[PDB]
C-alpha cells in the first residue's frame, strides 16, 4: 500500500522474532497480516487454546505492541455479547521499541561503567556487601583485613575484576545484532506516521473465516459523549 507500512511492519516483525519467543511471532504476524482480529478468530487461525493465547496477548499488551478494543455486538439469533479485537497501534509500538532499545543499551553502558570502577568488598557470613569507602572505616587496630561490623569476620574481595573485557564484547554483540532496529527507526523518524484506530484498521481487513461470528464493523452509539482512556487518536 505505502512504503511507510512495509518498513513499520518489518520493524515489528524483527523485534518479535528476536526479543520474544515463538508463539509471539504467530500471534503478532496474524494481526499484522490481517486488520483488527477477533479473539475467537485468532484462536481458530493458530489452533491454540485460551490458556495458551492469554499469556501471549498479555505480554504483548504490556509492551504496547498490540491494542485491545471491546465493543458490544447485537446478533439477531443470540443475545448481545461482548467481543474483543486485537490490532496494532504503530505510534505506540514504535515508541515502546525506541524506549526499550535505549534502556537496554544504557543498562549495558551503565554496567560497563560500573564494572570499570573498583570492586566493593563483601562479607561471606552475612552476605552484606561493602564499598571501598565503607570498608575503609572497618579497619582494625592491626590493619590487616577489613572486619565486618556485624560478624566481626575478615572481608573477602569481590569478583568482577576480570569481567572488564566481557561486558565490552556484550555491548559490541548487541549493537551488531540490534543494527536493523536503529536503521529502521531512522527512516521512520524521517517520515510521519498516522495513528491507527479500530475503525481505521478496518480499512485493510482480510476476513479470516467465511462465517465468523464476530461482526467486524464499528457502529458507535449515537451522540454518546462518554470517552474511555486511550479510545481516540489525533
Amino acid at each position: 500500500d505505502r512504503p511507510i507500512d512495509d518498513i513499520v511492519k518489518n520493524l515489528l516483525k524483527f523485534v518479535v522474532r528476536g526479543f520474544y519467543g515463538g508463539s509471539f511471532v504467530l500471534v503478532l504476524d496474524a494481526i499484522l497480516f490481517h486488520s483488527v482480529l477477533a479473539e475467537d478468530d485468532l484462536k481458530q487461525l493458530l489452533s491454540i487454546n485460551k490458556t495458551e493465547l492469554g499469556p501471549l496477548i498479555a505480554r504483548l499488551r504490556s509492551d504496547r505492541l498490540i491494542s485491545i478494543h471491546k465493543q458490544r455486538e447485537y446478533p439477531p439469533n443470540s443475545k448481545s455479547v461482548e467481543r474483543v479485537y486485537y490490532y496494532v497501534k504503530y505510534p505506540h509500538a514504535i515508541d515502546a521499541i525506541k524506549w526499550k532499545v535505549h534502556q537496554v543499551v544504557q543498562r549495558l553502558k551503565d554496567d560497563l561503567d560500573k564494572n570499570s570502577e573498583p570492586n566493593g568488598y563483601m562479607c561471606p557470613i552475612c552476605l552484606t556487601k561493602y564499598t571501598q569507602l565503607e570498608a575503609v572505616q572497618l579497619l582494625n587496630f592491626d590493619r590487616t583485613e577489613f572486619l565486618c561490623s556485624l560478624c566481626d569476620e575478615p572481608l573477602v574481595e569481590d569478583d568482577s575484576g576480570k569481567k572488564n573485557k566481557e561486558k565490552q564484547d556484550k555491548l559490541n554483540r548487541l549493537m551488531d545484532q540490534i543494527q536493523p532496529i536503529i536503521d529502521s527507526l531512522k527512516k521512520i523518524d524521517d517520515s510521519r506516521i498516522e495513528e491507527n484506530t479500530f475503525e481505521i484498521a478496518l480499512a485493510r481487513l482480510i476476513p479470516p473465516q467465511n462465517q465468523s461470528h464476530a461482526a467486524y464493523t464499528y457502529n458507535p452509539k449515537k451522540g454518546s459523549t462518554m470517552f474511555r482512556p486511550g479510545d481516540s487518536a489525533p
Binding site: 555491548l171 559490541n172 549493537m175 536503529i182
Partner: peptide, 13 residues
C-alpha cells in the same frame, strides 16, 4: 558516527 569502543550510536545518544 559511533564510538568504535562502546559503539554508542548518535541516534541513541
Amino acid at each position: 558516527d559511533m564510538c568504535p569502543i562502546c559503539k554508542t550510536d548518535r541516534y541513541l545518544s
